[PDB]
């Protein structure tokens with residue numbers, strides 16, 4: 001299958017590591033023009049060396065003001081991967097104002113800002129486009145101590161569909177991909193304990209967790225015009241978890 | 245059907261008017277003890293004349309600080325209806341930082357704050373209970389100029405299920421209600437325009453919008469032990485809208 | 489909550505036992521005139537004794553032709569609970585064409601056949617009515633060795649929605665119930681195995697299986713005009729199962 | 733993206749026309765060994781001249797016995813596209829036993845008969861595999877005069893999951909695709925009316941009906957190892973019909 005991302009400008013948030021990092025590499029090899037947006041300059045330093053030609057951008061996506069002008073004129077992009085996200089785990093009787101606030105500020109608000117920027121250009125150029133929001137499996141099934149997290153994720157999926165519906169006649173697409181645990185900095189944090197991640201794996205018919213590869217493949221797919229009739233969706237990449 | 249809410253302590257946020265008010269009234273006739281929480285003291289005053297023995301409470305539920313302390317000693321309550329909510333409607337490319345910010349602060353964060361309080365006592369007293377979140381039909385279906393509202397609403401549903409699962413073993417139940425347009429001040433904002441309401445009404449199999457009673461009847465049902473096996477759900481009151 | 493079922497004619501299939509018989513019983517006691525339809529003769533005869541006045545109708549609802557003349561002339565019915573159904577559990581690779589056939593003509597087709605008689609009755613009479621379909625928890629989550637069962641249920645859910653859509657403008661509602669296990673005839677069969685139960689009880693935030701009263705409550709609520717704005721729904725009575 | 737379907741045994745039902753045809757043509761081009769199965773002989777005769785190498789089977793998949801002796805000798809197939817279906821469009825009140833009978837023995841029963849054989853064969857070789865179930869978007873949303881057809885699909889979505897759950901541990905993935913109206917003779921039946929097609933285009937955010945590349949794009953993507961973390965899923969191809 002020819003995905004046809006070559007020669008396309010592609011913005012990727014949270015590019016510093018995990019799924020975003022891999023997603024930028026994977027996008028580079030394909031011959032896309034890549035803009036890597038992340039929080040730790042240290043990470044974007046290494047990236048650009050890995051994948052030459054990719055414009056790095058340091059910024060806290062949780063900062064409206066620092067983001068609006070740190071990308072306000074990042075030029076013409078064609079495809080966007082909203083993947084920067086932080087996960088603050090609290091049992092429900094312990095959730096605090098700060099946790100809540102940081103999470104939605106990065107988890108969803110940024111998504112809205114960048115998507116606003118990127119889409120605004122696309123429309124101006126009178127050109128089609130596409131966006132992928134990295135949601136989650138807990139975006140439709142709750143997990144203990146993730147009341148805020150799952151709220152951002154469930155929040156994300158509905159935002160995805162409004163964007164789809166409003167941007168629809170602008171020929172731009174919006175989809176989300178919802179993987180199970182990924183053994184990233186994030187993944188190698190909570191689900192470290194065997195029994196911990198064991199009880200989770202017992203719910204997955206394929207009996208294994210996702211890899212960056214898997215979720216990157218549905219992203220690439222959802223960016224590609226191979227899925228030109230798919231928009232406002234939640235493509236699971238959780239090994240069947242939602243099915244039972 | 246005997247709901248048996250009588251003599252029960254019941255908090256209702258956003259009780260000043262619309263579904264909140266009506267939900268207060270109906271809760272009164274049942275013989276339950278009611279705490280009506282609202283922003284405008286004026287709203288609470290009149291209520292009290294109607295429903296004597298209803299402890300009114302003024303506060304901005306969008307204020308963590310103003311809320312944590314005006315509720316620190318609201319006594320032992322046994323039932324909760326989170327209904328206070330604001331609707332900030334902006335097309336997707338015009339969404340603002342504050343619009344995002346207020347909406348989530350009221351429509352979601354408040355819910356966790358109050359619910360946190362009420363639940364601690366329930367757990368503390370070693371007592372069963374129940375919580376109702378007035379979500380919405382757009383919590384799972386997008387509408388124009390509702391990017392943030394639907395995302396709150398979408399958020400609320402996932403928040404409900406995490407609440408349900410964690411408080412589950414504490415014999416507390418959590419459920420949401422997702423009504424279609426209700427001809428309240430809120431409803432009487434967007435759906436004032438005929439053409440607007442026509443296209444929406446064209447979608448509803450029952451060919452009419454909901455009434456406050458309908459949503460109130462689902463709320464009482466969900467608070468009562470008549471639905472003691474339902475928790476973490478989304479009881480629609482959208483006249484069939486989700487079905488087709 | 490006065491539901492206002494008293495004085496209305498309610499047909500109840502699978503009335504012989506379980507949810508169907510607890511449901512007959514609840515309606516009788518509320519002043520409803522009931523037609524109880526079941527398979528076992530001796531089953532119908534005690535109900536009538538348990539509830540003087542109910543009209544018993546013995547027939548195999550998996551038989552189009554029997555059903556048609558054993559019910560075709562039943563008269564002006566106002567409500568309807570489709571509750572009859574069979575559970576033939578086979579591993580996917582052991583599914584039989586007989587199991588498929590029997591399971592779908594009872595668990596579903598008969599739902600179309602009776603719903604046609606009634607609905608047509610109301611529609612000709614130019615009077616509102618309401619229909620309750622008893623689906624299941626597994627209608628939205630796969631369970632082992634339930635390849636056909638869940639599929640009937642799965643088909644059950646959607647048929648409700650199509651029925652809803654079509655009968656909507658005839659002031660007739662259609663909703664389904666989706667309880668978790670109920671330790672009835674059906675329930676105390678496959679899940680008598682304490683390890684088979686736990687496996688399921690662990691996924692239930694309320695940590696208990698359902699009870700007949702629980703889905704009868706849910707049925708009556710939906711048959712009632714309390715819920716005059718709830719159509720096309722699938723009401724969980726799985727104590728949080730779908731939620732996590 | 734390297735699907736890597738080249739050289740593997742792929743069985744396609746309903747390969748005679750529409751999506752089944754297109755899926756063979758595209759599965760062939762990728763160097764795959766496709767066993768084409770359809771009901772009208774004259775169709776496979778032409779396709780076979782279009783795609784030299786394929787191995788057609790003329791048969792009525794509604795027939796358990798014929799199928800079971802027609803496909804018992806089908807060779808170690810590695811992938812599977814259950815596409816065969818029939819649209820018997822009747823208003824809910826006018827639905828007939830006959831139409832329900834056929835619709836569910838072709839659209840569903842067959843899916844179950846072909847799928848056992850392949851799996852069985854797949855498991856005996858101790859080899860992984862993939863299945864794709866061509867469902868529909870009315871599988872989750874109702875359309876008038878589609879009570880039976882939407883039902884089959886609805887059941888289809890759940891079959892997919894039980895299949896995905898029991899087959900999961902055998903390295904065999906199962907997934908469904910849910911396209912909107914395709915302008916096949918089938919879709920060119922109840923969707924040819926300018927007015928009937930218009931009120932559908934109005935609900936589709938992307939503002940177009942679908943063409944058979946799109947669904948074939950999703951099938952091939954789900955059959956490929958590129959999506960080996962996706963199973964028990966329902967990948968929509970309706971240009972956002974479901975989001976709003």
Ligand SMILES: NC(=O)c1ccc[n+]([C@@H]2O[C@H](COP(=O)([O-])OP(=O)(O)OC[C@H]3O[C@@H](n4cnc5c(N)ncnc54)[C@H](OP(=O)(O)O)[C@@H]3O)[C@@H](O)[C@H]2O)c1
Pocket residue numbers: 013014015016017018019020037038039040043059060061062063082083084085086087106134135136137179180181182183184185186187188
């Ligand atoms: N990891 C898994 O287990 C898993 C599972 C399901 C879903 N997901 C989702 O997949 C996406 C990425 O997860 P992951 O595994 O890639 O996590 P990760 O390894 O922690 O990577 C996240 C990246 O996003 C960046 N980032 C976070 N907040 C940012 C901000 N405010 N501004 C700029 N950059 C920011 C991080 O930069 P710094 O390191 O500099 O902060 C980091 O490079 C998320 O939406 C996450 O919710 C992950």
Ligand SMILES: NC(=O)c1ccc[n+]([C@@H]2O[C@H](COP(=O)([O-])OP(=O)(O)OC[C@H]3O[C@@H](n4cnc5c(N)ncnc54)[C@H](OP(=O)(O)O)[C@@H]3O)[C@@H](O)[C@H]2O)c1
Pocket residue numbers: 257258259260261262263264281282283284287303304305306326327328329330350378379380381422423424425426427428429430431432
């Ligand atoms: N309106 C509809 O058609 C509709 C439809 C579907 C769902 N819903 C939902 O159902 C619930 C009730 O809506 P409604 O139609 O009854 O609305 P309404 O007529 O606007 O009343 C909502 C009440 O909540 C209060 N409130 C709002 N924000 C508050 C805040 N930050 N702090 C304290 N009090 C606040 C308002 O009091 P003040 O005026 O004094 O602030 C008002 O009395 C909400 O959660 C709403 O989202 C409404």
Ligand SMILES: NC(=O)c1ccc[n+]([C@@H]2O[C@H](COP(=O)([O-])OP(=O)(O)OC[C@H]3O[C@@H](n4cnc5c(N)ncnc54)[C@H](OP(=O)(O)O)[C@@H]3O)[C@@H](O)[C@H]2O)c1
Pocket residue numbers: 501502503504505506507508525526527528531547548549550571572573574594622623624625666667668669670671672673674675676
């Ligand atoms: N119990 C469970 O755990 C459970 C859980 C979730 C949902 N449900 C659903 O609830 C409904 C009933 O379950 P249940 O536990 O009440 O079952 P039950 O105890 O086995 O009784 C069901 C009744 O339906 C009758 N019946 C079955 N086939 C019939 C036919 N072909 N014609 C006429 N009558 C027929 C049975 O009569 P005979 O025995 O005389 O045939 C019996 O009286 C079904 O839709 C089932 O799918 C059950």
Ligand SMILES: NC(=O)c1ccc[n+]([C@@H]2O[C@H](COP(=O)([O-])OP(=O)(O)OC[C@H]3O[C@@H](n4cnc5c(N)ncnc54)[C@H](OP(=O)(O)O)[C@@H]3O)[C@@H](O)[C@H]2O)c1
Pocket residue numbers: 745746747748749750751752769770771772775791792793794814815816817818838866867868869911912913914915916917918919920
């Ligand atoms: N048509 C649309 O607009 C549309 C829209 C949404 C979803 N879908 C779905 O997409 C899939 C195919 O539909 P389509 O548009 O391709 O339809 P189509 O143009 O009617 O072609 C379907 C093919 O299936 C074959 N077939 C049907 N019954 C069969 C049987 N019993 N045994 C063997 N072969 C059989 C037909 O062969 P003969 O007719 O030559 O016997 C025909 O070649 C289905 O699952 C359908 O539900 C279609």
